[PDB]
Each structure stands twice: as structure tokens, then as C-alpha cells.
Design a protein around this ligand. Structure first.
Ligand SMILES: *[C@@H]1O[C@H](CO)[C@@H](O[C@@H]2O[C@H](CO)[C@@H](O[C@@H]3O[C@H](CO)[C@@H](O)[C@H](O[C@H]4O[C@H](CO)[C@@H](O)[C@H](O)[C@@H]4O[C@H]4O[C@H](CO)[C@@H](O)[C@H](O)[C@@H]4O[C@H]4O[C@H](CO)[C@@H](O)[C@H](O)[C@@H]4O)[C@@H]3O)[C@H](O)[C@H]2NC(C)=O)[C@H](O)[C@H]1NC(C)=O
Ligand SMILES: *[C@@H]1O[C@H](CO)[C@@H](O[C@@H]2O[C@H](CO)[C@@H](O[C@@H]3O[C@H](CO)[C@@H](O)[C@H](O[C@H]4O[C@H](CO)[C@@H](O)[C@H](O)[C@@H]4O[C@H]4O[C@H](CO)[C@@H](O)[C@H](O)[C@@H]4O[C@H]4O[C@H](CO)[C@@H](O)[C@H](O)[C@@H]4O)[C@@H]3O)[C@H](O)[C@H]2NC(C)=O)[C@H](O)[C@H]1NC(C)=O
Ligand SMILES: *[C@@H]1O[C@H](CO)[C@@H](O[C@@H]2O[C@H](CO)[C@@H](O[C@@H]3O[C@H](CO)[C@@H](O)[C@H](O[C@H]4O[C@H](CO)[C@@H](O)[C@H](O)[C@@H]4O[C@H]4O[C@H](CO)[C@@H](O)[C@H](O)[C@@H]4O[C@H]4O[C@H](CO)[C@@H](O)[C@H](O)[C@@H]4O)[C@@H]3O)[C@H](O)[C@H]2NC(C)=O)[C@H](O)[C@H]1NC(C)=O
Ligand SMILES: *[C@@H]1O[C@H](CO)[C@@H](O)[C@H](O)[C@H]1NC(C)=O
Ligand SMILES: *[C@@H]1O[C@H](CO)[C@@H](O)[C@H](O)[C@H]1NC(C)=O
Ligand SMILES: *[C@@H]1O[C@H](CO)[C@@H](O)[C@H](O)[C@H]1NC(C)=O
Ligand SMILES: *[C@@H]1O[C@H](CO)[C@@H](O)[C@H](O)[C@H]1NC(C)=O
Ligand SMILES: *[C@@H]1O[C@H](CO)[C@@H](O)[C@H](O)[C@H]1NC(C)=O
Ligand SMILES: *[C@@H]1O[C@H](CO)[C@@H](O)[C@H](O)[C@H]1NC(C)=O
Ligand SMILES: [Ca+2]
Ligand SMILES: [Ca+2]
Ligand SMILES: [Ca+2]
Lengths: 107, 389, 389, 389
């Protein structure tokens, strides 16, 4: 099984900044990384698949990046509404393994 | 036929798609000796049509099928077998050795081109009438590659597109014009596409048209039109927002004609399209993200209008089954007023997605144009990955 | 033969039946790679006769044969293989895809018709000279179906009967006349039969005759005579009390000519008959209740006299062995003064009756008319359901 | 072709070697029914080229393959199968029985010669147009032997060399000239070679040339040039210090033309060479000591200059894979100005070196002359001796 590893487990930036969030995995998953965002008391939603393709209606300000084992979601212009847990998820082989989430606190 | 072919008809009115041929190769391969193939195509002779594909020198059930996911090995040939029979160890004919091919018949006999070697000392040999006649070394020493489907001839001239260089960069694609096996001429990629990979082609009214892969930065499709007589050509993109490559972004309301519609990076899948105005049909996977399902959609004037949408569909295979490569072919020698347009769909099985088995192979499924509006079925490879365990 | 055929002879005197060909497909399928078939037929070319049947895309012994009892799947083709060889993965040629067929040769080349799809969006494609040439959508969206045996041609014209609608109701049967693949004409069922299902046919003296299935309310048999030239036809029933469908009631002393002889409901089995006056022969199962045994009985004037009885028999297969479908065929191209009349018998095996194995497949057995009165043997499929466990 | 062949062209410029055909016979034989062969050759017809080899009457995986290391048995035939298919039980054609062969086509049809029997009552039968026409008894009752590769014809005349006597002694080699199957003439070995064993041949400009085995006392190679018209011949050695037999001593700076270059005793391996002046190429194993790897080296003027060295190479197969026999063949009937020169390499597997399996069989690998300087790949048999355990 592939193992999506996330660290840190909490992250904070102020309003208007950039933040970057590290998701890595066991072996080369060939960019097939998905990003979700789950805001407190809400379903997750699909941000990004193939580590870079923004899903319908997620804004330009969420950028996808990665390769091999190593992936990073970057948010820019950190709005007040961006506090949530971000989750990565492998989609190269079954079973689809998710990272453990990362809290984004806005400083 | 003792005289070379001319493309003298145009396409017939494509109003639905009937079934032409489906080998059940993987269902039959849990118990006959079928070879592990990948990259299929189907190409006709004046006297028969036959499926083709790259072999991996091992049967589905034998021990050496473990790892057939590797694209390139010195154990792969271009093999043919009769329509809807399996590529089996005993009915399969070998055409030429190596890991990327393209073959087509010139009216008189057939040409077949095989590419071989290491990634930086790879080499093409153009066979014609089952004898080797020309060889081509790499011009850029990075995995020299050609069509993976039927090439098309007019008056003794068959254009082949090749690409050598990277599927991430700028790569150096180069169109050749063979006649009877020899290099008549060749040309560097002219026109607007960024990168050209792996085309599938067709012919109507003395024009050879090709739909291809922008594996570099495109989710839309570079298309190459070749004049077999002038031995000349352009490239451009399909204007329609209905994107056919895969992985894909969502479909825009307004796609782009002359540059890669962006969203996905360094990834593609081989695919086709019939571009004939009001009578245009675009095939694409149902999945945005992976090779699942196959849909055929009428999108009138897709190549030109940058705001075109489907006016009709047809599901070749459900999103809950698997798809893969797709390319076109036509029975050029087939009595009538026009050309019955056809395509195949590679059904891929095994790894990386169904990883419980250590192999990867596939099935052909194949349809041709019916002018009547026929009802639709959807066409699964059909095997249960659990009986091979 | 470079010129279309004409039916210019009449039947030869049928005085006994010799063996023509029996594949031992199921006996050979416990150890070679035979495909699971069902619905066989046998049809000749000017140059060879070959068995046909619908495949189920899997071998007897492979794991996907489990459940081949399902009539319809997108994994069945019409396949041919040489006389008395098994339909094996490696010698079997595919003719066209789908679950109900009918094929015949017009003197020049052969036509083959395959029906496909879901029950309410099924579609027929008429192949001719191994190229598709016509397609037909459903006219009533309920399991569009055609002969399951050899169709017959005269002067370029080959009648096919089709049925779409239910085998419980009124259904809409429709006779087509193709020539070279195109729809020449077609006709709705004219004459006295209630429902027409699944015919088998033959030709003598410029007349194509057909014996069929009244799956609705008949234990006697609707018979269709077609004039290939006038492109016209009638339906009626076999008058004789000797009932040939199965399941069956006991035989009356006086059957009925113009309506379904009643007793059994919504059930049948495909079967044939040679209707030629004093020289008439009716095949039927020995079992009243199920597909066991096959008997051929001389019943002189069976089609007309409503009080006709056997004057002679011949057991093709014992009641303590299994039978199944049956249809007719003739070597139209075969030197002589008259037509040697022939038939096949599907030997069905597996489920639902021999349910210890999870599959259902069969054997052909086949006989042709001998004018001498030859001794008789009875001809078992032959396999032991216990060696597959 | 209805008229006998003439050798009217010379060799083409050999600047690199492309791939012509490789069956993956041993990789496919862990799961299809492939026969255990050894001693392959490849010879063309006007209409097709096909691989040949001696069979051992058993499949790789069946129990009787245990001990196929024994050269001679009354269970071996000369069999052919299409290019790059495996010699499989079902596609393999038998040519004639016995344990040493040589076959070639005379323009009109083909001859095939098989030798058979015990070592001291062995016998050759020359088949021609698949009928036996001449027989030859032993002239020295010690394992009468002929080429193990394509023999070559000119104007109806095909020289064959045979040897009977020991591969340790003086043995009695004898050149025959057949025409249409009959003994036209024959000659005792004339010229400077000590012992002649097992030649491989070729033809250019009305000359049939042969490179052979000095199994007696030579690590260099006796070469026989035959004038098919005069029906006459000489023997000599390859002058070049690059030694091609194997096992081998190190290469001298100055080899010897007219006597066996010494170092190794009673051992050899079948091998070839194209001797054409500046355009000469010598194939040899990479291993000094055993059958590993295969290299092709340009050694200009090798037959004559006693101080010649490589000016260019090409590795056919790495030293860390296995090689074996090698002989030459050419598509004599192949359109062009010159002769595309070709060779095969027997990939041997099993015992005695990979002794974990009880059998010994092999693969063909085969290349032909490219005038362009193509990149190189190396071509492994490919099977894992561990999946047969
Ligand atoms: C008997 O058989 C007949 C004949 O076979 C049946 O008729 C055919 O049935 C088809 C299904 O109804 C029908 O197809 C549809 O035709 C319309 C034209 O009015 C066409 O627009 C439809 O195309 C969309 O639909 C499929 C899903 O059902 C999509 O997967 C496909 O992409 C098309 O949708 C996308 O296209 C546009 C741009 O993407 C958007 O407008 C649309 O929102 C959608 O976007 C999403 O999907 C994309 C990929 O899935 C993705 O990239 C994007 O980001 C979005 O996620 C469809 O073709 C045939 O027209 C009809 N033909 C005929 C002659 O009748 C009949 O119903 C059967 N009857 C019975 C009793 O069985
Ligand atoms: C050597 O070989 C030769 C040549 O092969 C042998 O000669 C042949 O042998 C046959 C057996 O004797 C013989 O057949 C019989 O011919 C008579 C004419 O005189 C014919 O009526 C017979 O037909 C009935 O018999 C079988 C059972 O044996 C039935 O299963 C069949 O249905 C026929 O019976 C039914 O028909 C009528 C209406 O149904 C009724 O009259 C009758 O009661 C019966 O009813 C029941 O059966 C039905 C189905 O089984 C059912 O639907 C109904 O409800 C009832 O339940 C039979 O054909 C051949 O004529 C004869 N031919 C020649 C040239 O000789 C020879 O004997 C062999 N000799 C040696 C030494 O081996
Ligand atoms: C892309 O592909 C191209 C085209 O394929 C590549 O180019 C080819 O690459 C070859 C490898 O570099 C090259 O071959 C060499 O050419 C020289 C001429 O300048 C030739 O002398 C070389 O031959 C010796 O080398 C091999 C080992 O590498 C030996 O195993 C062989 O025997 C030759 O060595 C022996 O020969 C003499 C007498 O024996 C001695 O001078 C020498 O010391 C040596 O002796 C030992 O070896 C014997 C057996 O191994 C043994 O009996 C003796 O006792 C000693 O132990 C070699 O052929 C091709 O010329 C070149 N061709 C072209 C057109 O370029 C290119 O590099 C590739 N590029 C990329 C990016 O992949
Ligand atoms: C093909 O067309 C050319 C003109 O484009 C003509 O000269 C040639 O003979 C034609 N060949 C055939 C078989 O139609
Ligand atoms: C082959 O498959 C086996 C299991 O069947 C697997 O463990 C092994 O790593 C695979 N690959 C190779 C090169 O053996
Ligand atoms: C078939 O019979 C018709 C008359 O029904 C005739 O015109 C035609 O040429 C005949 N063809 C052959 C081959 O007998
Ligand atoms: C297949 O056969 C097995 C036993 O061999 C049976 O238990 C199963 O229900 C059958 N059907 C399917 C769909 O697996
Ligand atoms: C072969 O050449 C000879 C002269 O060596 C000539 O007489 C003969 O007819 C030729 N045959 C062919 C088919 O070239
Ligand atoms: C055959 O192989 C077996 C093991 O598979 C070996 O023990 C035996 O000695 C071999 N030779 C013969 C003649 O049986
Ligand atoms: Ca792309
Ligand atoms: Ca009935
Ligand atoms: Ca030696």
C-alpha cells in the first residue's frame, strides 16, 4: 500500500501570504496525487488531481506541484476562509491512501 | 490489388456506430495461450482486415508476463492475427521487431515500420513486402517513436510521423513520405502544435488527416493534415472545448485553436477524431482523470469553431469499465460510394490499477460508421482479475 | 462459383439417413482449448461445408465458462471451424459479433448477419463478403432475433426471417429479402401462424421453405414458404398430429392446420422438417417433456393431411442421451440430379439439467439423406460430466 | 520463381546490422507448447524466409525433454516454422528425419538433406520438392555430418559439404554438387585445411563461400570457396589474428593463413564470416572460453592479410548472456542492386551450464546488413531458468 505522509500537522500564516504543504509517499506515484480541503463541519472537496489540475471552480490561487514521491499544495493570498485541514491522496494504485491532514491556522 | 490506392471518396455520413470486431483476448487468456499485447491497432489489406498490437513475448498465464507494464524490452514484435481471434502463440504472424510501430498497405503490398534499440541508440527499420528495405537512425537519441496505428497511403505514398526527443520538452517530430519502402522525402513539424506524439490517421479526398497527443502541455489535440501529393503539411489544434486527451481539465466554453489548451501537464493518451465539418466525431475517455469508458460525440465543426459542443453521443464503454488507447482505421478497399469510418479501443488490464496480478495486457473492441441511427451497447473487456489468482 | 446460385433440383428420395459429421467438441474440451458454443448450424460454400455456432468467449475448462447459460452477452460471435473439428480457440474464424445469427452463401460469396445490443436497443448488421454493408435497428425493441441456421439464396436473393417483440405475445416477425447485402424488400408475417420464431430453411425447385417455432401458443410448427423471385410468402402450420416442437402434449389423431395445436404454453425449441409430399420427414425430440433424443420420422404428406402418421423411423440419438436445437442445411453446390437433404442436432450439456458443472455448451451431430435403407446408430455427445469436477 | 537462381549481385556495404527476426521461443515455452530444438538456421524461399532447427521430439515443458543435450537420437527432424514464431507443436512443418541437416532452395523448389542412423551406419537422404530422390551411405562410418545452415545454389547447382570420420583426427570431408536432387559430382577436400567441420555459406558474384570449424587443431577458421560452375573448390584459413572459433587462445598479432592457428584442441563451435575485402565482417563469441556473447567486427581484408585487426564493432549479445552456434543466410530473392547479408545466433539454454533444469534448448536472434550506421542493442534469449522449477 502506498503511504501518504504529511508533516507538519499544523501550519500557520497570515492573511494575504503563501503557505505550502508537504505530502510525500512511499514510492514513485507518478504525479497522481489528489488534494482535498475539508473545512470544519463540511464534506471534503476536490481541489486538485494529478498534483496540478485544479478542479471546477477552485481558484487560480491554489497551485499544484510535485513529482516522484514528493508533493506540495501551495495556497497564495491566504484568505480568512482558508482555515481547514488539507489532505493528500495517492491515486496511482489501489488502495488509495490518504495523508493524515494538515491544519492551516491563520496567524 | 495490382495497382496502388488513391483516396477518391470522402467519409460516409456518421450517424451512429455499429460493432465491427472485438477479440475477447483477456477472457480467452485465462485458459488458451494468448500473448500479452499492448498498443493495438487494426489495419486492412485489399483482402482482409486484421488486428495488430505490440507483443511482450510471453503468454498472459506464463511466468514471464510478470512486469509487461514495461513499454520497452528487446522481446516485443508487431504481430497480426485474424479479426476477432486472440493474438495467440499459434495464430499470430510476426511482422518486425521492436517497441513502436505503424503499418499500412499501399494498394500493392504492405509496409511495416518497427523501431528498436536502447532509448539513445534506437533505430527504425521500414519493412515493405515482408523484406527490410530502409533503416533510420535516431536524430535526437531520445526514444524514437512512430504512430501505434495504421499509416495511410495515396498513389504509392504513405506518410508516417515519427518523434524523437522528449515528451516533456520540445521534441523533434519529423513527417516522412515513403514510397515502395524508400525515403522519398521528409519534413520537420510545421504548423502550430507544440509537441506531437503518437498520431492516428485517416484518408478522404486525397488528404491524409491525423489526430495526435500533446504529451507536453496540452489537453487538446494537435491535428496534422498531409497532402500526400505535394508532400507537404500543417499542424494546428482542435478548436472545440470538448477536450479529448486524458487526464483532462473540465471542458471550457471556449477552447483554443492554435495553442495547447492548458490544465494538465506531461501526460496523455493516444486518441483519434474524424474531422469532417458538420459530420465530425470526437472520441474521448469518460473519465477526466483516468482511462475509463469511451464516448463518441458528434461536435459539428469541432476543428474550426472555438465554441463547439456535442449535438449527439454514443458510449462505447462504460466509465465503470476500463479503456485505453484509441486510433482509427478504415477499410480503404471496400465497395461503395464512401468510406465507412472506424476506430478501435484498447481495453487495458492488469497493473497499475488492478494491481493484484503482476501483468498488464488488453483487448480490442472496434466500431465502424452506420448511417442508420442504431441503438447502443457498451463493450467491456470482460475478465475477472480474480480468476487469475 | 463466379455466378449466383439457382435452386434447380428437388430433393432426393429420403429413405434413411447416413452420418455426415460429428465434432466431439465436449469430449475434446476436457483437454484441448475448445470454446463454449451454443446454437450451432452448418452451412456450405461452393468449396467447403463448415459448422457454425454462437461462441461465449471462454473455453469449456477456463473459469469464465461459469454461467454460459446466459443466452446474451456482449462476448458472443458467430464462428466457423472446419467440419468435425472442434470450435477451438485456434482454428475458429470469427464471422461477426452479437447473439443471434444466420448466414448463407449466394453463389458468389457469403452473407452473415449478426444481431447485437441490449434487448431494447439491439441491432442487426448484415455482413457480406466479410465486410459490413447494411445495418437494421429494432422495430419493436424486444430482443430482435433471426434464424440460428443457414439462410437460403436464389438468383442473388436470400430471404432471412427476423422477429422482434415477445415470445409470449404477438411479436412482430418480418421477412427480409437481401441481394448482395442490401435491403431489396421486406414483408410483415403474412399467413396463419400466430407467432414465428427462429426458423430453419431449405430450397428446392425455386422455393425456399422454412419450419419454425411457435413459442407463443403452439406445439405444432408454423411453416413459411417463400418465393425468392416474387419476393413474397405464406405461413401455415404442419397439419400432422405427430407434434415436433417440445415440450409437447400427447399426439392427437387429428392435428390442426391453420391454428396452433394447443397443450403447451410459452416454450419451444428450434427444429426442422423436410416437407415434400410422400417424401416428407419430420424431426422431433423423443421426450415429450425435455430435450432428450432425436427421431426422424417419415409421415407422408404431413404439411397437408390433418390425419397423418409415421410410416418409418430413424433414431438419431437415444432418449437416454440429450438433444437440443436442430436445423437444416444442404450442400447446394454438390454434383448430381437432386439435393441431398441434411440436418444437424445440437447436443446440450451442462446446466440446467446436469447442474454439477457451472457451464452449458454442446456438440454437433449431423446426418444427410441416403436413398439406400441403411442401418441406424444412435449418436451421443459422449462426455462424462464427472471428469470436469 | 519458375527458373533457377543465379548469384548475380555482390554483397551490399555492411556498415552496421539491424534486427531481422528473433523468436522468443524459450520465453514462450514456459507456457505454450514449444519443441525443444537445437541447431537453428534460417533459409529463404523466393516467397518467404523461415527459421529451421533440429527438433528433439518433445516440448520444453514435457517430461521427455529431460536429456535433450544428446545430439543424436532417432527422434529429431529438420522442422521449419514462420519467421519469429516459436517452433511449436502446431505450426512447425517437418522437412525430413535425422540429426544433421542442410537445406536450400534452387530457384525452382527446395532441397533438404537429412542424415540419420547409428554413428557407423548413418545415411543421408537428399529430399527435393518434398519427395526423397537420393540417398548417400557413409564413406568412413563415423558420424556422417553436413552443414547445419542454408546451403547455396547457382544455376540449378547447390554445393553441400559433408564430413565423416573423426573430429579429433583426420576425417574425410567431401563436397557434393547436387542439381535437382541427383549427384552431379563430388570432390574430396582440396586445399590447406586440416579438418573441416560444419560450414555456413553464402553466395556473391557466382561464387559460393563457406566459413567452417576446425574442430581438430584450429582456433582459426578453414574457409572453402566453391565455383558452382566449374564444380571445383579450395580450402584455406582466415589470415586475421582476430580468432573467431571458441574456445580460443588470446589473439596473436600475426595469425596464420595456411595452417591451424594453435592453442586450443578438439573443440569448436559453428560460426560464419563475410569475406569481401575492405568490407569484411567476422562474427565470434565475446568469451574466449565459452559460448557467451556475440560480436561482429569489421576486420578489413581478414581472409588475406595475416596482420589484420578490427576497424569497427557491434555487439549482438552481451558476454553476460549466452550465445551458441551461428551461421549465415541471405534473402537471395530480394529486390535491389546487392545482397543484404545476414546471420543468426543460437541462444543456448539449459544444461550443461544452467544445469538446474534437465533440458537444453535455444532461441534464434537474427540480424541483416544496414548500410546506414545504426545504433546497437544487445539481444538476450531472455528466460529465467528459475521459472521452470
Ligand atoms: C437507445 O440507443 C440510442 C442510440 O445509441 C440512445 O440515444 C443516444 O443516447 C445518448 C445518451 O442519452 C445520447 O448522448 C447525449 O447526447 C447529447 C445531445 O443532446 C450530448 O450532449 C451528451 O453528451 C454529454 O453527456 C455525457 C454523459 O451522459 C458526458 O459524459 C459527455 O461528456 C457529454 O457531457 C459533457 O459535455 C459538455 C462539455 O463537457 C457539457 O455540456 C456537459 O456538461 C458534460 O460535461 C462533463 O463531462 C465531460 C466528460 O464526461 C467532462 O470533460 C466535463 O468537464 C464535465 O465533467 C450525450 O452524448 C445520444 O445523443 C443519443 N443518440 C441518439 C441518436 O439518440 C437512446 O437514448 C437509447 N434508448 C433506449 C431506450 O435505450
Ligand atoms: C437395423 O436398422 C434399421 C434401419 O435403421 C432398423 O429399422 C428401423 O427401425 C425403427 C425402429 O423399429 C423403425 O421405426 C418405427 O417405424 C414405425 C412404422 O411401421 C413408426 O411408426 C415408429 O414410430 C414410433 O415409434 C417411436 C418409439 O419406438 C416413437 O418414439 C415415435 O414417436 C413413434 O411413436 C409415436 O407415434 C404416433 C404418434 O405419436 C403413435 O402411433 C405412437 O403410439 C407413438 O406415440 C408416443 O410417442 C411420441 C414420441 O415418442 C409422443 O409424442 C406420443 O404422445 C406418445 O407418447 C418408428 O419410427 C423404422 O421404421 C425402421 N426403418 C426401416 C427402414 O427398417 C432395424 O429395425 C434395425 N435392425 C436391426 C437388426 O438392428
Ligand atoms: C551507439 O551505437 C553505436 C553503433 O552501434 C556505438 O558504436 C559502436 O560501439 C562499439 C563499442 O564502442 C564500437 O566497437 C569497437 O570498435 C573498435 C574500433 O576503433 C574495435 O577495435 C573494438 O573491438 C574490440 O572491443 C571489444 C570489447 O569492447 C572486444 O571484446 C573485441 O574482441 C575487440 O577487442 C579485441 O580485439 C583485438 C584482438 O583481440 C585487440 O586489439 C583487443 O585488445 C581485444 O582483445 C581481447 O578481446 C578478444 C575477445 O573479447 C580476445 O579474443 C583477446 O584475447 C583479448 O582478450 C570494438 O568493436 C564500434 O566500432 C562502434 N561502431 C560505430 C559505427 O560507432 C556507439 O558507441 C553507441 N553510442 C551510444 C551513445 O550508445
Ligand atoms: C492513382 O491516381 C493517380 C493520380 O493521382 C493516377 O495516375 C494513378 O494511376 C492512380 N492509380 C490507381 C490504381 O487508381
Ligand atoms: C514477479 O512476480 C512476483 C510474484 O508473482 C513478484 O514478487 C516479483 O517481484 C515480480 N517481478 C520480478 C522481476 O520477479
Ligand atoms: C439463375 O437463374 C436466372 C433465372 O432465374 C438466370 O437469369 C441466371 O443467370 C441464373 N444464374 C445462374 C448462375 O444459373
Ligand atoms: C461461478 O462458479 C462458482 C463455483 O465454481 C459459483 O460458486 C459462482 O456463484 C458462479 N457464478 C459467478 C458469477 O461467479
Ligand atoms: C542462370 O545463368 C545461366 C548462365 O550462368 C543461364 O543460362 C540461365 O538461364 C540463368 N537462369 C536464370 C533464371 O537467370
Ligand atoms: C530425468 O530427470 C530427472 C529429474 O527430473 C532425473 O533425476 C533423471 O536422472 C533424468 N534422466 C532420465 C533418463 O530419467
Ligand atoms: Ca495531453
Ligand atoms: Ca412451441
Ligand atoms: Ca576450433
Amino acid at each position: 500500500d502506498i503511504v501518504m505522509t504529511q508533516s507538519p500537522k499544523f501550519m500557520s500564516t497570515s492573511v494575504g501570504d503563501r503557505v505550502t504543504i508537504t505530502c510525500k509517499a512511499s514510492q514513485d506515484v507518478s504525479t497522481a496525487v489528489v488534494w482535498y480541503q475539508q473545512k470544519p463541519g463540511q464534506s471534503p472537496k476536490l481541489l486538485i488531481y494529478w498534483a496540478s489540475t485544479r478542479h471546477i471552480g477552485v481558484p487560480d490561487r491554489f497551485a499544484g506541484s510535485g513529482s516522484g514521491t514528493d508533493y506540495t499544495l501551495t495556497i497564495s493570498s491566504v484568505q480568512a476562509e482558508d482555515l481547514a485541514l488539507y489532505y493528500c491522496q495517492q491515486h496511482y494504485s489501489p488502495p488509495w491512501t490518504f495523508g493524515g491532514g494538515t491544519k492551516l491556522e491563520i496567524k | 490489388i495490382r495497382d496502388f490506392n488513391n483516396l477518391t471518396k470522402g467519409l460516409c455520413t456518421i450517424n451512429s456506430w455499429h460493432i465491427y470486431g472485438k477479440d475477447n483476448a483477456v477472457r480467452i487468456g485465462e485458459d488458451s495461450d494468448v500473448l500479452v499485447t499492448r498498443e493495438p491497432y487494426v489495419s486492412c489489406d485489399p483482402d482482409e482486415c486484421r488486428f495488430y498490437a505490440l507483443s511482450q513475448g510471453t503468454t498472459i498465464r506464463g511466468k514471464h508476463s510478470n512486469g509487461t507494464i514495461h513499454d520497452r524490452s528487446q522481446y516485443r514484435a508487431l504481430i497480426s492475427w485474424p479479426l476477432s481471434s486472440p493474438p495467440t502463440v499459434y495464430n499470430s504472424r510476426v511482422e518486425c521487431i521492436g517497441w513502436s510501430s505503424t503499418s499500412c498497405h499501399d494498394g500493392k503490398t504492405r509496409m511495416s515500420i518497427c523501431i528498436s534499440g536502447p532509448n539513445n541508440n534506437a533505430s527504425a527499420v521500414i519493412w515493405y513486402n515482408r523484406r527490410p528495405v530502409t533503416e533510420i537512425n535516431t536524430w535526437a537519441r531520445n526514444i524514437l517513436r512512430t504512430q501505434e496505428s495504421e499509416c495511410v497511403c495515396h498513389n504509392g505514398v504513405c506518410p508516417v510521423v515519427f518523434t524523437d526527443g522528449s515528451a516533456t520538452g520540445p521534441a523533434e517530430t519529423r513527417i516522412y513520405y515513403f514510397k515502395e519502402g524508400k525515403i522519398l522525402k521528409w519534413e520537420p513539424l510545421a504548423g502550430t502544435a507544440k509537441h506531437i506524439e503518437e498520431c492516428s490517421c485517416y484518408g478522404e479526398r486525397a488528404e491524409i488527416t491525423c489526430t495526435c497527443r500533446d504529451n507536453w502541455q496540452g489537453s487538446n489535440r494537435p491535428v496534422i493534415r498531409i497532402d500526400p501529393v505535394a508532400m507537404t503539411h500543417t499542424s494546428q489544434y482542435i478548436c472545440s472545448p470538448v477536450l479529448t486527451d486524458n487526464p483532462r481539465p473540465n471542458d471550457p466554453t471556449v477552447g483554443k485553436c492554435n495553442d495547447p489548451y492548458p490544465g494538465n501537464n506531461n501526460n496523455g493518451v493516444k486518441g483519434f477524431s474524424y474531422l469532417d465539418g458538420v459530420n465530425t466525431w470526437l472520441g474521448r475517455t469518460i473519465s477526466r482523470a483516468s482511462r475509463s469508458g469511451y464516448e463518441m460525440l458528434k461536435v459539428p465543426n469541432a476543428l474550426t469553431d472555438d465554441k463547439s459542443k456535442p449535438t449527439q453521443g454514443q458510449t462505447i464503454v462504460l466509465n465503470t469499465d476500463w479503456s485505453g488507447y484509441s486510433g482509427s482505421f478504415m477499410d480503404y478497399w471496400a465497395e461503395g460510394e464512401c468510406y465507412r469510418a472506424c476506430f478501435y479501443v484498447e481495453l487495458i488490464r492488469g497493473r497499475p490499477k488492478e494491481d493484484k496480478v503482476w501483468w498488464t495486457s488488453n483487448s480490442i473492441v472496434s466500431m465502424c460508421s452506420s448511417t442508420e441511427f442504431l441503438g447502443q451497447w457498451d463493450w467491456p473487456d470482460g475478465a475477472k482479475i480474480e480468476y487469475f489468482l
